[PDB]
């Protein structure tokens, strides 16, 4: 058997990216061998979270009684080479016919990133095949006419950008540097930032697209000569680590660093030697949501051909996996449950049985998905008309001397003061 696939009465696609590789030129039309590339522990954790969720539901005699959920899951280290997995989810018996109005899957969870979603979503949108993303935060996916069957269980970039602005406005500094990943996620972030501060005291004094060619020596030289103290770094794990590691090596000091939620809970950087030297790190963070039972599931899982379904991660420390950045955990959990509930309601399941042999079209799943209204771990799972989530909080953290991301504030989407911060918890310099 395999972690990546599970037979069931109905199938859910899982689109993950367990390995990382930078894009490169290719001269053949074929999938990429991701199993040989850089392993990513927290993405792998999120992958397990989906496996955990499905098994939890299959264990339940209440949700989907006597109806098993299976999955086909993928490790797409490359968005441009992800299409074989995507085709498999949409095919009738390993065949696609383009002009069709019984697909292998009833919906899909993922993908994690905006680049992955932009590359493949039109193929799902055409037949209103439902996608529930646990990570994609692009502004553009809130345009329902462009992405009619796209939903997500994390907030749009606009909300995180608002929280970041609230962090800046709580303090006295008004010149800001904005370092962003040279990708769709990063560019959209810069755009929202620029839009949000235009009518405020905040001045964007410097900004730069981050990639492998960044002259960090020169970037930090300029930042220093403009006497800029606040540096927003809006970037995924790989880019954020490049920035902060370069900052340590170039003896950047006395800065105030502000992280987006994709690296405020990073687990490598708070323990890196010298991290202290570059100043103070704050960030917007997803609060830690405890998923009961997950710990036991991981211990159990670690104790254990189609492309992009191979982990090559034998002999992982169970400890390291448990302790990995837990951001996006509830987004994954809630995404699986939303599809489960949608299926349950589409089948017209009662409290202890389901009408059987019923053929389900993905578009029927969609209608129930958009009408989602259920409780999960004392949160209420709903989506607005744009497919954006109406659940999930944002907090402010401070990386404190023992290496923890200590909560020091809460971001309120509605409140008169949008951002509270207990400033005495923050130990500067």
């Amino acid at each position, epitope marked *: 058997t395999s972690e990546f696939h599970l037979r069931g009465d109905y199938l859910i696609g899982g689109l993950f990216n367990i390995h990382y590789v930078a894009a490169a030129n290719f001269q053949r039309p074929q999938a990429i061998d991701c199993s040989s590339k850089l392993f990513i522990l927290p993405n792998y954790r999120r992958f397990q979270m989906m496996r955990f969720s499905v098994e939890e539901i299959n264990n339940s005699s209440s949700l989907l009684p006597n109806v098993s959920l299976g999955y086909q899951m993928f490790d797409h280290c490359s968005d441009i080479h992800s299409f074989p997995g995507i085709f498999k989810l949409l095919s009738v018996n390993d065949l696609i016919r383009p002009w069709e109005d019984l697909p292998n899957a009833i919906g899909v969870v993922g993908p994690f990133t905006s680049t992955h979603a932009l590359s493949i979503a039109p193929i799902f949108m055409t037949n209103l095949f439902p996608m529930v993303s646990y990570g994609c935060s692009g502004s553009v996916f809130s345009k329902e006419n462009l992405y009619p069957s796209f939903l997500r269980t994390v907030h749009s970039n606009k909300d995180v950008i608002n929280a970041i602005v609230g962090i800046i406005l709580n303090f006295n*500094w*008004r010149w800001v540097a904005f370092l962003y990943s040279d990708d769709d996620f990063g560019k959209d972030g810069l755009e929202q930032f620029k839009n949000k501060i235009e009518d*405020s*005291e905040i001045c964007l*004094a410097f900004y730069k697209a981050i990639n492998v060619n960044t002259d960090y020596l020169q970037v930090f030289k300029q930042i220093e000569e403009q*006497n800029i103290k606040v540096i927003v770094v809006f970037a995924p794990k790989v880019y954020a680590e490049a920035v902060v590691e370069s900052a340590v090596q170039l003896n950047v000091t006395n800065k105030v660093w502000i992280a987006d939620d994709g690296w405020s809970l990073n687990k490598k950087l708070p323990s890196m030697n010298g991290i202290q030297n570059i100043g103070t790190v704050l960030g917007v963070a997803q609060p830690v949501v405890t998923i009961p039972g997950f710990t036991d599931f991981i211990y159990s899982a670690i104790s254990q051909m189609f492309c992009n379904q191979k982990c090559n991660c034998s002999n992982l420390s169970v400890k390291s996996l448990l302790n990995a950045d837990p951001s996006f955990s509830f987004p994954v959990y809630a995404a699986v449950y939303a599809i489960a509930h949608a299926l349950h309601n589409t089948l017209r399941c009662g409290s202890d049985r389901c009408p059987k042999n019923i053929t389900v079209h993905p578009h029927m799943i969609l209608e129930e998905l958009k009408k989602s209204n259920f409780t999960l771990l004392n949160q209420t799972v709903q989506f607005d008309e744009n497919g954006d989530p109406k659940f999930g909080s944002l907090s402010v953290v401070f990386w404190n001397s023992s290496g923890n991301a200590e909560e020091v504030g809460s971001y309120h989407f509605q409140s008169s*003061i949008h951002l509270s911060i207990n400033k005495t918890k923050i130990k500067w310099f």
Partner: antibody
Amino acid sequence: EVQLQQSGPELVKPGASMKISCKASGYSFTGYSMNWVKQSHGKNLEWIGLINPYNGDTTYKQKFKGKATLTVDRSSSTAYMELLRLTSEDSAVYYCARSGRGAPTTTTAWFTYWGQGTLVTVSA
Amino acid sequence: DIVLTQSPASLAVSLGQRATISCRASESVDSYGNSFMHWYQQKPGQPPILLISRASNLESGIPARFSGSGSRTDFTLTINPVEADDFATYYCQQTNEDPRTFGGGTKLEIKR
């Protein structure tokens, strides 16, 4: 365009308190500090303090601590300054004034927009 | 607290001629690569108007006959040529350091 519109002149009793309003329009209210300035008839300008309308944080010049109280009402985009325990030396023209854009800190911002001024006469 | 001293206290300058107004600070008002000294015009009964920020930056809408110069502790506002509506009190203001302080002002008179 930006307008700062202050409440009208006010005759107030010695020992009493009074509240000046500064109604801000034409821009995003919580984005900029609102300053207050005192001008005695001698004509010196004196900075009283500022308020961050985003979170309510205040900074005062020492001599106005416990003498002036800056607040904001975010739902009406109005900044308020309350003057306590009025004496004839509180007789003056009082201005609200918005911080501009381009300074490196809230502290260094200059004043680009001014209310029209509020004349306070402390007399029995 | 930074003390700003303006000179002269009062000034009479003919139309078409140049007015020069000094402001001296007790301590440097430089930081962040800038000089945080600003100049304001105040006509009687009117709010002050910002003419020049950061020693030399002419504000939008302000006529080009107004210019500023200087650094550290010594600053100059220049009005050239002076015109008939330029009579006012001119104030300097430092914002380098809490609390913000103003100069006692310079009253410019039109000579005729």
